[PDB]
């Protein structure tokens, strides 16, 4: 795509990127919006939201701690 | 005179035009460093540029 201005697997990519972050018009302090807000609050949104997805989704931590298999039972399942 | 004339705005006073647009559509990375730029209370830099 920089090489074309110097599903394709996977062209929302490059497509959706492009097509919307190119139509801004006072795109440099949006970039540092979407920058500073997605760091920390969209890493632990995902890194968050996966493991409460599961935590709740069949859990059932049940096998609750380790149900004392000894001891070195590490991951043993 | 067409070559001065139907030769067109260049006389080209859109660029003012690119001075005011360009002076609001991009005073979002000028201003970026400025924000506060003469003092430090929004914590910036006095440094917007001169370039166009």
Known sequence: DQSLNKQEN?????IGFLLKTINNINKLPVAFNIITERAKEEIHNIIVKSTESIRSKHPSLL???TSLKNDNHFGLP | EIKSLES?????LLSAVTR????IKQV???NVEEQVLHFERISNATTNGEIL
Do not use: C, I
Request: charged share 25%; no cysteine.
């Open chain 1, 10 to 14: 996977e062209g929302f990519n490059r």
């Open chain 1, 63 to 65: 096998k609750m701690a």
């Open chain 2, 20 to 23: 005011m647009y360009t002076q």
């Open chain 2, 8 to 12: 067109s705005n260049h006389e080209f």
């Open chain 2, 28 to 30: 979002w990375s000028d």
